[PDB]
Amino acid sequence: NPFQFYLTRVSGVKPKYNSGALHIKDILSPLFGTLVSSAQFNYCFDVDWLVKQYPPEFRKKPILLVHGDKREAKAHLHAQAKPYENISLCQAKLDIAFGTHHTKMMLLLYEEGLRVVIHTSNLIHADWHQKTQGIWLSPLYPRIADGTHKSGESPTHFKADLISYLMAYNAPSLKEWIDVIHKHDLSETNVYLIGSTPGRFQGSQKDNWGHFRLKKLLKDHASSMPNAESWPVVGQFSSVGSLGADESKWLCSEFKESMLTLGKESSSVPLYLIYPSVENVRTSLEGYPAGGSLPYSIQTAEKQNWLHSYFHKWSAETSGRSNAMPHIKTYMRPSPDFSKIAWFLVTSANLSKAAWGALEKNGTQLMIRSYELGVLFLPSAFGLDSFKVKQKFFAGPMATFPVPYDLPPELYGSKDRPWIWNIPYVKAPDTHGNMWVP
Numbered sequence: 001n002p003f004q005f006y007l008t009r010v011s012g013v014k015p016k017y018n019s020g021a022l023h024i025k026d027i028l029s030p031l032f033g034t035l036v037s038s039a040q041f042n043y044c045f046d047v048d049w050l051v052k053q054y055p056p057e058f059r060k061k062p063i064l065l066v067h068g069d070k071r072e073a074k075a076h077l078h079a080q081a082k083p084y085e086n087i088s089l090c091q092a093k094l095d096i097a098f099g100t101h102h103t104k105m106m107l108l109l110y111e112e113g114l115r116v117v118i119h120t121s122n123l124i125h126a127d128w129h130q131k132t133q134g135i136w137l138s139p140l141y142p143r144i145a146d147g148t149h150k151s152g153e154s155p156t157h158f159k160a161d162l163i164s165y166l167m168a169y170n171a172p173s174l175k176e177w178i179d180v181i182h183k184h185d186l187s188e189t190n191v192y193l194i195g196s197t198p199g200r201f202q203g204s205q206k207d208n209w210g211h212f213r214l215k216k217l218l219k220d221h222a223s224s225m226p227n228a229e230s231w232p233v234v235g236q237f238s239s240v241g242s243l244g245a246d247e248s249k250w251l252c253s254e255f256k257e258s259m260l261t262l263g264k265e266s267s268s269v270p271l272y273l274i275y276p277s278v279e280n281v282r283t284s285l286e287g288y289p290a291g292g293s294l295p296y297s298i299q300t301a302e303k304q305n306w307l308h309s310y311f312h313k314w315s316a317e318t319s320g321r322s323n324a325m326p327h328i329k330t331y332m333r334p335s336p337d338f339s340k341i342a343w344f345l346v347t348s349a350n351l352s353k354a355a356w357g358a359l360e361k362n363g364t365q366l367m368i369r370s371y372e373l374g375v376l377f378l379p380s381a382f383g384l385d386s387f388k389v390k391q392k393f394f395a396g397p398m399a400t401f402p403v404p405y406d407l408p409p410e411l412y413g414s415k416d417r418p419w420i421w422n423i424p425y426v427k428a429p430d431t432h433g434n435m436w437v438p
């Protein structure tokens with residue numbers, strides 16, 4: 001397959017549903033390269049656990065943890081890492097209120113080259129145990145010979161775009177990794193980088209990040225088709241922000257407008273949002289504790305009950321993962337019969353203005369609060385007009401894209417409710433025999 005899109009291993013499904021999945025130990029294994037140094041970008045870390053996932057022979061190689069923690073949380077992370085003299089830390093600046101360092105990425109420097117891993121899992125045991133998570137694995141990028149002058153750039157501009165993303169941190173530890181990336185050949189990369197960084201972006205910089213970055217890529221590298229108005233938009237996420245008092249405030253006015261862009265020319269497009277119901281969580285492998293990683297608060301939800309009519313259940317029979325609650329985030333553009341897709345995005349970005357950006361200053365400025373990162377699969381980058389949807393995620397022409405959940409998505413039933421993590425559920429027990437009392 002050309003796509004190199006994987007799911008994490010799930011404990012408790014039959015082996016056929018983990019053949020072709022990846023655990024963090026597989027990613028860090030010497031089979032993937034001889035590790036010299038690594039950078040772990042993430043939100044939450046269990047440092048003792050993390051070091052144990054590296055092969056024993058690699059556990060004292062330098063590790064950089066890139067995080068967004070402040071004050072006591074920052075102190076707690078430093079205390080976690082202090083026993084390991086080989087671990088350095090980089091605090092990503094979050095100068096806009098209510099922002100988060102959400103990006104999940106590994107930079108893996110080998111004797112043999114460099115690998116980039118963009119994924120959706122926190123570096124804690126529970127995120128790799130029984131959840132649905134996504135991974136994109138870059139090729140092994142060879143080093144450019146010293147004295148040779150070449151760009152090492154791909155047709156998707158991934159090298160420059162990744163360096164640009166790292167430059168936004170303004171961090172000395174990441175300038176070192178920028179210099180590493182400069183020295184490597186990333187020309188084989190067939191995905192486009194879509195990042196979010198904190199800031200207020202106008203003019204030439206508006207298209208660099210967030211949903212304007214997506215819009216720019218879809219304008220430049222996808223083509224509209226007849227009946228494009230009938231191709232739905234699907235969004236799938238583990239958290240929802242405050243989107244406003246009705247759909248016209250942000251969801252259907254600027255977010256959906258960017259998502260439905262195709263081609264360069266100048267809406268009743270259906271919008272499907274996939275988010276676990278209470279019943280999805282209750283009957284999941286983890287039970288109600290899976291809801292600890294679905295942090296939709298009642299304070300937010302009661303302000304936007306209009307949103308929940310867009311919500312569809314989590315269902316993933318295609319990958320054996322209906323009971324493995326999603327922490328992956330994906331966005332895609334299927335055909336009206338869900339047999340093809342015009343593009344697919346896997347990302348850290350949830351359904352929030354903080355992640356995707358919101359227009360300010362009379363539409364002239366895009367304000368983003370958080371760091372996010374994902375990769376976009378466009379048919380044009382693979383010599384194709386569209387992707388056929390793979391019928392079984394783990395089954396056997398490799399030019400079909402492995403969508404990890406079922407299509408068409410299924411609307412909530414009248415008795416279903418979105419999972420809301422900070423109210424109790426005491427009507428029916430979960431798969432471990434327990435109720436949920438926050």
Ligand SMILES: O=C(O)CCC(=O)Nc1ccc(C(=O)O)c(C(=O)O)c1
Nearest residue numbers: 043102122238239240241293295352
């Ligand atoms: O901020 C909001 O809009 C509501 C609270 C929230 O969403 N918190 C949160 C924090 C970290 C992660 C992560 O895993 O990095 C995630 C996630 O991705 O589920 C969610």
